[PDB]
Amino acid sequence: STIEEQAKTFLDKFNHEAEDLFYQSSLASWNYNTNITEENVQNMNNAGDKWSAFLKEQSTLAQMYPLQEIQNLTVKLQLQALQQNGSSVLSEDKSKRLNTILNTMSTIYSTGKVCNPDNPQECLLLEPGLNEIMANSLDYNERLWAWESWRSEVGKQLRPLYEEYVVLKNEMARANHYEDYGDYWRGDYEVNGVDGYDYSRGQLIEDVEHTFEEIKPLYEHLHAYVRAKLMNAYPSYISPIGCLPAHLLGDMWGRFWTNLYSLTVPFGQKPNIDVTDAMVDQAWDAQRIFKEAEKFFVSVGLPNMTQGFWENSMLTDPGNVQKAVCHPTAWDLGKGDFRILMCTKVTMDDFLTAHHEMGHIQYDMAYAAQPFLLRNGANEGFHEAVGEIMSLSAATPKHLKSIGLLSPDFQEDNETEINFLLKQALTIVGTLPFTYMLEKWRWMVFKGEIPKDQWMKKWWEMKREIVGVVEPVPHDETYCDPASLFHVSNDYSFIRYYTRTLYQFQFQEALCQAAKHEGPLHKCDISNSTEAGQKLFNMLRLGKSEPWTLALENVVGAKNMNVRPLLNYFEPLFTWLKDQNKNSFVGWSTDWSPYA
Amino acid sequence: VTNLCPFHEVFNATRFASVYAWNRTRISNCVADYSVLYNFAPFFAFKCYGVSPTKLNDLCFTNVYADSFVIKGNEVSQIAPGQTGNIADYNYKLPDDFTGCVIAWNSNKLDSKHSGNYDYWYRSFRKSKLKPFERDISTEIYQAGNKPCKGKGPNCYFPLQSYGFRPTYGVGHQPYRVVVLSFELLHAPATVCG
Ligand SMILES: *[C@@H]1O[C@H](CO)[C@@H](O[C@@H]2O[C@H](CO)[C@@H](O[C@@H]3O[C@H](CO[C@H]4O[C@H](CO)[C@@H](O)[C@H](O)[C@@H]4O)[C@@H](O)[C@H](O[C@H]4O[C@H](CO)[C@@H](O)[C@H](O)[C@@H]4O)[C@@H]3O)[C@H](O)[C@H]2NC(C)=O)[C@H](O)[C@H]1NC(C)=O
Ligand SMILES: *[C@@H]1O[C@H](CO)[C@@H](O[C@@H]2O[C@H](CO)[C@@H](O[C@@H]3O[C@H](CO)[C@@H](O)[C@H](O)[C@@H]3O)[C@H](O)[C@H]2NC(C)=O)[C@H](O)[C@H]1NC(C)=O
Ligand SMILES: *[C@@H]1O[C@H](CO)[C@@H](O[C@@H]2O[C@H](CO)[C@@H](O)[C@H](O)[C@H]2NC(C)=O)[C@H](O)[C@H]1NC(C)=O
Ligand SMILES: *[C@@H]1O[C@H](CO)[C@@H](O[C@@H]2O[C@H](CO)[C@@H](O)[C@H](O)[C@H]2NC(C)=O)[C@H](O)[C@H]1NC(C)=O
Ligand SMILES: *[C@@H]1O[C@H](CO)[C@@H](O)[C@H](O)[C@H]1NC(C)=O
Ligand SMILES: *[C@@H]1O[C@H](CO)[C@@H](O)[C@H](O)[C@H]1NC(C)=O
Numbered sequence A: 001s002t003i004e005e006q007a008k009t010f011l012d013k014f015n016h017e018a019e020d021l022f023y024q025s026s027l028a029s030w031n032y033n034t035n036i037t038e039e040n041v042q043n044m045n046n047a048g049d050k051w052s053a054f055l056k057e058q059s060t061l062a063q064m065y066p067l068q069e070i071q072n073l074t075v076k077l078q079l080q081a082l083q084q085n086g087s088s089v090l091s092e093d094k095s096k097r098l099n100t101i102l103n104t105m106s107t108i109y110s111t112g113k114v115c116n117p118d119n120p121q122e123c124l125l126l127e128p129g130l131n132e133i134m135a136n137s138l139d140y141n142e143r144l145w146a147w148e149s150w151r152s153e154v155g156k157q158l159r160p161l162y163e164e165y166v167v168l169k170n171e172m173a174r175a176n177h178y179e180d181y182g183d184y185w186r187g188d189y190e191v192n193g194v195d196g197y198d199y200s201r202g203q204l205i206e207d208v209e210h211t212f213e214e215i216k217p218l219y220e221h222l223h224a225y226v227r228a229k230l231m232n233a234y235p236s237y238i239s240p241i242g243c244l245p246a247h248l249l250g251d252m253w254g255r256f257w258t259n260l261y262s263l264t265v266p267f268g269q270k271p272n273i274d275v276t277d278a279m280v281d282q283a284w285d286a287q288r289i290f291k292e293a294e295k296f297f298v299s300v301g302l303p304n305m306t307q308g309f310w311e312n313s314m315l316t317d318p319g320n321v322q323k324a325v326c327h328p329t330a331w332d333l334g335k336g337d338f339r340i341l342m343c344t345k346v347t348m349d350d351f352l353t354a355h356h357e358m359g360h361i362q363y364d365m366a367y368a369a370q371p372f373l374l375r376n377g378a379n380e381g382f383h384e385a386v387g388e389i390m391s392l393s394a395a396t397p398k399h400l401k402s403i404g405l406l407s408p409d410f411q412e413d414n415e416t417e418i419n420f421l422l423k424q425a426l427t428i429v430g431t432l433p434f435t436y437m438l439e440k441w442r443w444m445v446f447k448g449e450i451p452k453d454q455w456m457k458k459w460w461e462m463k464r465e466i467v468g469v470v471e472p473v474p475h476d477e478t479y480c481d482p483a484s485l486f487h488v489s490n491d492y493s494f495i496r497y498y499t500r501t502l503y504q505f506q507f508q509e510a511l512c513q514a515a516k517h518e519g520p521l522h523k524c525d526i527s528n529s530t531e532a533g534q535k536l537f538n539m540l541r542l543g544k545s546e547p548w549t550l551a552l553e554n555v556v557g558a559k560n561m562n563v564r565p566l567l568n569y570f571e572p573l574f575t576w577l578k579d580q581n582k583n584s585f586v587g588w589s590t591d592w593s594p595y596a
Numbered sequence B: 001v002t003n004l005c006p007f008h009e010v011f012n013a014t015r016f017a018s019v020y021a022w023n024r025t026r027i028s029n030c031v032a033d034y035s036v037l038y039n040f041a042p043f044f045a046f047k048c049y050g051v052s053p054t055k056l057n058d059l060c061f062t063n064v065y066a067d068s069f070v071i072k073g074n075e076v077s078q079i080a081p082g083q084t085g086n087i088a089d090y091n092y093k094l095p096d097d098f099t100g101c102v103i104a105w106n107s108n109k110l111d112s113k114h115s116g117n118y119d120y121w122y123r124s125f126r127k128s129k130l131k132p133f134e135r136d137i138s139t140e141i142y143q144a145g146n147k148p149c150k151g152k153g154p155n156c157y158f159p160l161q162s163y164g165f166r167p168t169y170g171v172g173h174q175p176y177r178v179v180v181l182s183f184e185l186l187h188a189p190a191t192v193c194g
Helices: A004-034 A038-064 A074-086 A092-111 A141-153 A158-175 A183-191 A202-228 A259-264 A274-282 A286-299 A348-366 A381-391 A396-405 A414-447 A450-465 A495-515 A531-540 A549-556 A563-578 B053-058
Strands: A114-116 A117-123 A327-332 A339-341 B025-027 B064-069 B101-106 B119-125 B161-162 B176-182
Touching: A004 A038, A004 A074, A004 A339, A038 A074, A092 A158, A114 A141, A158 A183, A183 A202, A183 A414, A183 A531, A202 A259, A202 A414, A202 A495, A202 A563, A259 A414, A259 B101, A286 A348, A327 A348, A339 A348, A348 A381, A381 A495, A414 A450, A414 A495, A414 A563, A495 A531, A495 A563, A495 B053, B025 B053
Parallel strands: none
Antiparallel strands: A114 A117, A327 A339, B025 B064, B064 B176, B101 B176, B119 B161
């Protein structure tokens, strides 16, 4: 007979109704994504509207308990989540206008296509075309034309939409009794009302700044080496002491450097590593692929799947009659069920993605005995990182030798190890600085320090200042360069990638230390060790109850992030690049421009 | 001699009753039945904490009690001597020193509907704890606030929810089958033997 008891009973009813409706929505989404029919989209919309209306109803009901006299710290978390999700705040007309703008931006930009110049016969979409354009095709003029087509005429007539959207979202953030929308994003990382491992919104910026300051020299040396290697390919557009152009990073959107692996790797005489040819000769199919992937998690001690997921969770493409857009994702069906959707082809990358999805589903099954608004990761990046680590620690040559596909005649050469480390470090070090730059600019714009007529100018200025990559052709303020990103168009949170990349090396270092492996960090395996599995299981079943600081300290003996495990991982390539660095240039200047 | 009495209607009885009001069945004064107890319907559990049933037919007890219902497939551990949590302490309480056999087995194929089995209610809000071997059929709107009921709303809730079932569910949350065996005795013959 108390306010907390009343709140607990309310949560008891919530943790049944929400379960039912979320299961409905998950079934509808799974059926739509495995089977594309108009009536399937109809029931999708019906389920979405039902879920939105239900959340609105309970957010309206939440006024019974004032959010000031609750002490259990779990009911408080549940009620705060209820107040955060499902509460309509702004006026109906303003909300409708904002939602209309959001709907009219992303879908139209996705469906936008550019035709063959002076030839309307061919009009390639986003999925084909540019993927091969930013590939082995070395036509500088064609790549520049594609970049101009994908940037100029869309940023023009997309700029006003985002210019109104930022103001509308600032109005929404102010209406939600909050500070700037940057504060609203940082809110997810903020947890308070606890002793010892307390956090807030005024520490993440400083942590990011410190990590970037610590990591700068490694990226400096790596991109200097990349520029030195690339000088030979196109010695007509890059100054020796200038800046790199935008459209020669191997991808129009950047964010990844895996494409440039081809004409950058040293010691091409040493063969690479791949088992694709041997797989078909040994008669490997999708079922055996998934069984082999699951065998590792079985051996480490974690529970394996049941007569559910295996019978369900279609893994083979059923031709074109039941064609479906298949991006491998882990499905949380709900009410004691888990599924995986993925088109399967016999390739190393597909095997790696299968490992990633298996880790995702294993984690999601690991945490299940919690209320509805508690089943998630402590931070946004944990959910992806806990699978990224498992995917990473399976392509090691020791793991391949344990598997047995690789012939023993393969030689453990230091050159081969250097090449593998370079291949990994390309993507790993490329993904960080651009992400930090984009986040810094988006936070600066949302807070407010520059006007719209200087927005793009300041964009390009700080892009050259930090990233060191200059646009090949100067851009006016009518365009919107950041708007090209899909996640920018969908205004999804972007710091997740940086956080997970920072956390994964902490996890790997701690787990390898637990396994007590001797040698270089990359040659570390957990095939037979069980203490690492127990240490990870100590956290995988927690949920959102314990804060991220407490969980991370309990796992790795550290209350926050630190780049030192990453530096230790990259020490060998760091030494090799330091040895190679004898006829290169240190640092870069923004004085040079591609347009003279 | 030349006669006996089976449990033919204990199973194969089609319609069951929810845990809302667990029904009670009883037999007496005729030959018992234990030979065909475990020759079909592979049981998920067979824990007989009262007396080992290997020689159950050797001894007898008058007026045995037989019960059956469908609740879940994972919370079977709730039905045990001295354990609480939703069902165990609010719908069907178990005596502390009771002696009997608890049998639970899975019949997901039979008792699931592909369009949604939404016709098996259960209670999770009762005023107080329950006494050993106590049932109830009461239907009153639950209240936990200063104001009276006068309908539903803030701090006004229905005392009943539903067991929505879907065949695509995983193991553990599917509707299993639960049967409970019990017996008593006073000055009388034991009335059920073999
Ligand atoms: C409170 O409210 C907030 C927002 O209102 C909720 O946050 C949302 O949470 C969901 C999931 O919990 C987020 O969904 C995620 O979307 C990502 C974006 O992917 C896009 O691109 C793919 C194609 O690659 C599309 O298929 C997809 O539809 C998106 O358009 C996904 O990448 C995420 O998937 C990740 O996890 C799966 C496994 O689950 C992995 O296999 C994937 O590889 C990937 O790592 C995910 O689906 C959603 O974006 C969030 N909203 C926002 C605005 O960010 C909270 O969940 C809610 N609180 C609750 C419900 O308690
Ligand atoms: C804050 O609220 C939480 C949520 O209820 C409280 O946790 C609860 O603590 C009790 C006390 O142990 C738990 O009861 C026990 O449950 C187990 C079954 O899990 C049962 O076998 C035991 O006999 C006992 O009844 C209860 O389960 C637990 N609830 C949850 C959701 O974990 C917590 O105590 C509260 N803290 C304060 C300071 O109010
Ligand atoms: C994909 O979806 C379509 C329609 O959304 C399904 O087609 C229906 O299937 C049911 C199943 O018996 C039939 O009763 C309907 O008559 C079908 N309608 C049409 C228009 O074909 C189809 O079965 C789904 N695919 C799979 C593999 O189940
Ligand atoms: C972990 O244990 C498994 C089996 O317990 C090891 O798998 C064996 O690996 C050797 C490698 O030479 C093979 O010859 C065996 O055939 C494998 N076992 C089976 C049953 O096929 C695995 O190698 C161990 N992990 C590590 C890192 O050594
Ligand atoms: C893993 O799968 C095997 C089947 O080969 C099963 O016997 C075992 O019980 C599973 N692991 C767990 C923890 O249930
Ligand atoms: C009921 O008994 C008949 C034979 O009398 C048998 O064929 C059937 O399978 C039984 N049903 C169940 C649910 O055991």
